[PDB]
Amino acid sequence: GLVPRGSEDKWRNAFDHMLMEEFEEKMDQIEHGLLMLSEQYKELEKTKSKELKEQILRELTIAENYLRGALKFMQQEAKRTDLNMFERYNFETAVSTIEILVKDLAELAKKVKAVKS
Amino acid sequence: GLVPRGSEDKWRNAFDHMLMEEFEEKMDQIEHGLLMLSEQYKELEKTKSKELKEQILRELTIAENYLRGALKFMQQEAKRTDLNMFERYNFETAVSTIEILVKDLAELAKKVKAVKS
């Protein structure tokens, strides 16, 4: 049942496949949540709701914390000495995708904090 | 739309709900992977397959790295200064659930390493 170690084009390890599939799903969910928070931000510019402002900031903090933990996992697996082409590509891509999303979150946080409430 | 901050019986934060709503189910899937590896270990005791031994160890190394990180994360969430009754219970329970899996993984790793291959 074992994937040959010489395979270059697929996940050789079952836990890599499982965990990376769940990570990818979470990144899609976070990107969508950020889009929803951006739209709440648009409402906040008009209403100046203190509760909405504080809540968006809480959400952004939660997402950031999660992504920082994910990033540590990805960077650590990316330092593996035994990495095939497919695995290296998937881990390096994940690192890139997270680092971008962390930036997008921090940018929304800045806009939200700028709302005089 | 926002959950009142005084609510005690649910996730107040959407990103907490997103991250945690299927948590215990996801951990069940890790537990199941550990079961499959335990059963492979029983085959290994008979065959003494070097490849099977190494592959079980690789899988447990990946799961260990994931869980050590998830544990540290959940322990920090349980230190939040604003936690309601439900949020605290769920974070604390998650810490316990992860601790159990970490212990089971370390025990299996020890038995697998001992197979003289």
Residue numbers in the entry:
A (entry chain A), B (entry chain B): 1 to 117
Published text:
Among these, group 21 allergens including Blo t 217, Der p 218 and Der f 219 identified in B. tropicalis, D. pteronyssinus and D. farinae, respectively, are known as mid-tier allergens in the allergic response. The structure of rDer f 21 adopts a bundle of three anti-parallel α-helices similar to the group 21 HDM allergen Blo t 2116, and group 5 HDM allergens including Blo t 514,15 and Der p 512. The crystal structure of rDer f 21 revealed an elongated dimer structure with molecules A and B interacting in a head-to-toe orientation. Helices α1 and α2 form an intermolecular anti-parallel dimeric interface while the C-terminal α-helix (α3) is fully exposed to the solvent.
The structure of rDer f 21 bound to a molecule of PEG 400, rDer f 21PEG400, was determined to 1.5 Å resolution from a crystal belonging to C-centered monoclinic space group C2. The structure contains two molecules per asymmetric unit forming a rDer f 21 dimer. Each molecule of rDer f 21PEG400 is approximately 60 × 17 × 14 Å and forms a coiled coil bundle structure composed of three anti-parallel α-helices denoted as α1 (A14 to T47), α2 (K50 to A78), and α3 (M85 to K113). Structural comparison of two molecules A and B representing the asymmetric unit of the rDer f 21PEG400 crystal structure shows a significant structural deviation localised at the α1 helix of molecule B between residues 20-30. The r.m.s.d. between the two molecules is reaching up to 4.3 Å. The dramatic conformational changes at the helix α1 of the molecule B are caused by the binding of a well-ordered PEG 400 molecule (from the crystallization buffer) in the pocket of the rDer f 21PEG400 molecule. Interestingly, the coordinates of other residues surrounding the ligand binding pocket including F23 and Y66 are well conserved. The conformational changes enable binding of the ligand into the dimer interface cavity, an event which may otherwise be prevented by steric clashes. The binding cavity consists mostly of hydrophobic residues including A70 and three aromatic residues F23, F73, and Y66. The PEG 400 molecule in the cavity of the rDer f 21 dimer interface only forms one hydrogen bond to Y66A (residue Y66 of molecule A) and is further coordinated via several hydrogen bonds with water molecules in the cavity. The lack of direct hydrogen bonds between the PEG 400 molecule and the surrounding residues suggests that the cavity would prioritize a hydrophobic ligand.
